[PDB]
Amino acid sequence: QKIAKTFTVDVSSPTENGVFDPASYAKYLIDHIKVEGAVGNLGNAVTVTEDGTVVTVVSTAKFSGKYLKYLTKKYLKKNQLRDWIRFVSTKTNEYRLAFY
Amino acid sequence: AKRTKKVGITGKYGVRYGSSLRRQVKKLEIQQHARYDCSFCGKKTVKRGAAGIWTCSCCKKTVAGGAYTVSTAAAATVRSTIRRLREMVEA
Amino acid sequence: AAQKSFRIKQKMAKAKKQNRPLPQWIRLRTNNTIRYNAKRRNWRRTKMNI
Amino acid sequence: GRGAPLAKVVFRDPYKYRLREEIFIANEGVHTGQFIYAGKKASLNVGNVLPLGSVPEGTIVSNVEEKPGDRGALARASGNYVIIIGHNPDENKTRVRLPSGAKKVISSDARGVIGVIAGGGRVDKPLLKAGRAFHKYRLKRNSWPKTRGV
Amino acid sequence: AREITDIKQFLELTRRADVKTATVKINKKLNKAGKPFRQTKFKVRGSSSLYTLVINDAGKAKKLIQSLPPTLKVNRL
Amino acid sequence: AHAQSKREGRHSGYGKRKGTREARLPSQVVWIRRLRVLRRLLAKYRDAGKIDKHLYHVLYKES
Amino acid sequence: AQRVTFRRRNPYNTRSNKIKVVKTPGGILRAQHVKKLATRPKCGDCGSALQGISTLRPRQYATVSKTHKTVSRAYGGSRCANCVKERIIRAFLIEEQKIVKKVVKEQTEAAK
RNA sequence: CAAAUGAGAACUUUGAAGACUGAAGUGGGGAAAGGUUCCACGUCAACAGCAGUUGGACGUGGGUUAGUCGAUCCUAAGAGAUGGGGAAGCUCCGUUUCAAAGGCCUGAUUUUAUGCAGGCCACCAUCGAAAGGGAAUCCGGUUAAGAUUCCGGAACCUGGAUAUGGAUUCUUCACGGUAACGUAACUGAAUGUGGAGACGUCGGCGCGAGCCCUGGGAGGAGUUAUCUUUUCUUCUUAACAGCUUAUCACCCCGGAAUUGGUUUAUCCGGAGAUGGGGUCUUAUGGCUGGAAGAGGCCAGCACCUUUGCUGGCUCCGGUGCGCUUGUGACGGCCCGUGAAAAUCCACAGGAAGGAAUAGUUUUCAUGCCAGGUCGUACUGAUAACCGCAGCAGGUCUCCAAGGUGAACAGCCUCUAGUUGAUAGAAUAAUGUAGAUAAGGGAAGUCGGCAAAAUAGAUCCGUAACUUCGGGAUAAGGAUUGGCUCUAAGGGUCGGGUACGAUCAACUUAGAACUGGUACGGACAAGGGGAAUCUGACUGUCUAAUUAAAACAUAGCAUUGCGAUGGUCAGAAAGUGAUGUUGACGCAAUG
RNA sequence: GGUGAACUAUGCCUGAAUAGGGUGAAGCCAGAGGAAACUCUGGUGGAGGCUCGUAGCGGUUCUGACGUGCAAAUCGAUCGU
Secondary structure (H helix, E strand, O other): OOOOEEEEEEOHHHHHHOOOOHHHHHHHHHHHOOOOOOOOOOOOOEEEEEOOOEEEEEEOOOOOHHHHHHHHHHHHHHOOOOOOOEEEEOOOOEEEEEOO | OOOOOOOHHHHHHOOOOOHHHHHHHHHHHHHHOOOEEOOOOOOEEEEEOOOOEEEEOOOOOEEEOOOOOOOOHHHHHHHHHHHHHHHHHHO | OOOOOHHHHHHHHHHHHHOOOOOOOHHHOOOOOOOOOOOOOOOOOOOOOO | OOOOOEEEEEEEOOOOOOEEEEEEEOEOOOEOOOOOOOOOOOOOOOOOOOEHHHOOOOOEEEOEOOOOOOOOOEOOOOOOOEEEEEEEOOOOEEEEEOOOOOEEEEEOOOEOEEOOEOOOOHHHOOOOOHHHHHHHHHOOOOOOOOOOOO | OEEEOOHHHHHHHHOOOOOOEEEEEEEEEEEEOOEEEEEEEEEEEOOOOEEEEEEOOHHHHHHHHHOOOOOOEEEEO | OHHHHHHHOOOOOHHHOOOOHHHHOOHHHHHHHHHHHHHHHHHHHHHOOOOOHHHHHHHHHHO | OOOOOOOOOOOOOOHHHOEEEEEOOOOOEEEEEOOOOOOOOEOOOOOOEOOOOOOOOHHHHOOOOHHHHOOOOOOOOOOOHHHHHHHHHHHHHHHHHHHHHHHHHHHHHHHO
């Protein structure tokens, strides 16, 4: 059950329009993802990887796409990207951001 | 363990109907809900189904008997009398 | 009732077919004093009692 | 509606290959799996169907025929019986004591079951409740409750 | 519907002169994660019952479908 | 959130009871459990040999 | 929670109108009418449930094979083993005792 | 509130709000009844006690698809011919009675189908249930309206002729299991017998199903000034077929007092317990087929031929005095013991028949054909029924979410459904309905009428009297919130001859702290006591002025009657009720 | 001379419906006492034309509303079960 899982979020659409950048998004993700519901617990159990246009996280502890979508919507609401950006999923653990 | 002084099974009727009527009912109600001996099998398993229907739960035999007892005193007397008049043929 | 006999269903049929206004062409016919269907029936108003 | 139990008895047909069932009134002591012998040569045992003339004085009989062949008229209710007072072989007869106390003389060919009807002592328990009288008469007939004429 | 476990009972049923319909269905079924196999079902259709054979071996399916007579209406989907 | 507080023990004082002791939890049910707890322990000890059949019987009647 | 309806035109909870709630392949909750549960056949001698005989409704005994309705003994489908065994012991022993009574009556033919 | 539609909008539609029914619904179906009110399109003279563009209105049309759902078949209380008997007679009794009341196999089997010796009887009409008994169907889709009926798949039952697959010509009508019994089959007439059909009610316990709760994950939606990996929602699997799966029951084997096993409930065992081994009923569950291709949830392409195509996911669990329903094994009750028949099978039996490609098995498997007739829309009620009506009345029933709480109480909410009832203006007196009140406290009044008053739960405490059962929640008093803690109470294993991590649920009890001493904070929810009259009690009646002390009642007592009888009915009768009866009964009274 | 038991009264036949509490009968278990007879205590159990109280079924009081009514008998509260 303890196998590592790889969740990917394709930020290509917001980044091409240059309104939403993964540099701040990944930093928010690592700062606000919590395991055991406490502080000091991001001890390489979950790590977020940013390439500039496709941002992924890997987790050896527990983590879900529900959590990922929940945190992402928190960020989009925080910086007022909602009503323009949607956190969508292509396949399993293959989420992305959409402008439409 | 002793829940009532005297009413016994008639404690279900509570306070109603009179003590004399409850006393009379108590006598026959204990008789009619008692277990009796089965002469056929020797065990204590003879229940009353309805008045006059006595059923052994082991040997599955049904005995015709009294309304509230497996055998009334009158039937046992007739049993002896019919037996006594029968033996005149023997001697 | 939904579960009706054939005889009742046939009575429903005749009553439904009779329940029409007078044909407009028979009005113009000569010496005719029929201006309307005086044997009209509405389910709410008059029951057919069968 | 009957206080007395009934006995289902299976006799064989003497003339055809068939089992003939009969509905006897159960006498006290009769049990399932028991043989009962019916006829003039039947032994004086509880459950047997002897003619009245074949039984001694003082025999306790029940479901006794009023006439030979009527299949039983007297002493049929629970706990009731007939006693044989005596015989009158000339003009073949037998005088008996009925449950009401009445004396009656009838033909010695009338049959009866030896013993007393089962279910006796029924009226020794108070009904205690209008509801018990209600249930008693709903399987009998519509005779209850009774409004007084006054 | 009826189930068959034996191949030669399937073969006896394809030749009954009453079974003229066959339906082949391929499913993605997982028994163990490390070995995701491809399940197929041969759905023989008779008069009073529909017959389905189950094999969990992808390779044996190819040899089994080869042996069907060409006159039988075969539905592959 | 309130179910969690009740689990921690809050909101169950005398001012929050509206049914009787038996209505909230039948005393039969509590006895049903107790006897089944005792009986499954006695049969367990009998099968494991900790107590023999003779001690088992007297304790079974005791429980 | 989803609520269901009778599928027939009888709206009353009679014996022949019992329903069970089932979930369907379409995902919805529906009523399903279940009929009277079958009663097992009973031995004619003692009334005990017959072993080795299927319990169906009376009409379904017409279409089922003989093996299900019977067992492989004398009186197999009508009286259970212990009753037929009792009949076997009884039949032999009475006829044996009959030969005993036959010779006890037969001695008077030698005496006279 | 706005828009749209309309000369015309308080009332019609659409959106936005605000509310209510709050799952013994204002929801989703039916029974009776109605009869077309269903649905669509136009449409507003009249009707909808204001209005009207709307309608259960008006006009014109469309619509109800069955071997499996019902009727039909069966019998129930009971109706009712014939035979016969009454009756002037319309008719009455009578329902098996004083009646000459009956099929299927190679009989025959070529003027032949009854020209003519082939058996069993002991049948006695028929009608009477759309909730009783019954042969057999499910899922998905589909319509303006029908669907368990149409369509697509997948089954079953009944009837109907042969036919192939496994068995006889060297034992004719099977083998196996010590046995319970098993299997793919494995002849069986008359006659007889048995079972199923086929049954009350209540209580607790167990087990399922569905619903409720909940963890992970995979999706979608909500909230995000701040804040639980958050709130809501989808994640489903029919009939039928196969395998497997049970409490109970039964069989084989050591033969039991130190009596043992055992339920919540105490029953069982030398008539053989405990223990060890052992079959079947899709009881019920699981797996597979049905069947993922269905259906459901997401993402993407179609861009005015009344139409789809693509990609995924649809997976794992956990929990319980939960709710409801079913089942099971039990236990309680009765002076009450809780239909019938049709129908189906089984058994007993031993009539008949069977050897050159045959004879039987058509209760094994597979195969072929048919399943008519009548009903099927809709309402089922503050507008489809009945009450003169679109009447606050009346009218049978199934399903039943969350929270609070003992609770299908009250209150609030989800799904679903409604938002209907003439309206607009500051609302005088008098009202109707709901309330508050200084001090007094029944002085009011016929009368405490009306109202008020500690009402839940926990603890304490509880008198006279009593038929010993009660009285009793007697009386009377204290506590109750929030928070932070503490204690007690359970389930699941590897035994070299006392040991632990796991995991799990709400009931109790206690402590500290805290606050305008508040706390069953709304809701919900006994006033009590001392006595008299009266009826014992529970129950019943004057529908529409009397609910009572009246009537019933159990108990008590009295009366008649042993059948050619008592009581009662009928014009009569070869006529009836009691009576399927028999004095522990029936009938008549108090 | 006819017609009505669709209301209602009563019998019968066949169906259906009725939360949650209180009290705590018999039967049963375990202890305690006793020389015996038997008594006591704690449990268990779940009886009753018992009881508080929904649905239901009724209809007590306000002599409330209304009394050319919603209604030729209803409405509300209070009540019986």
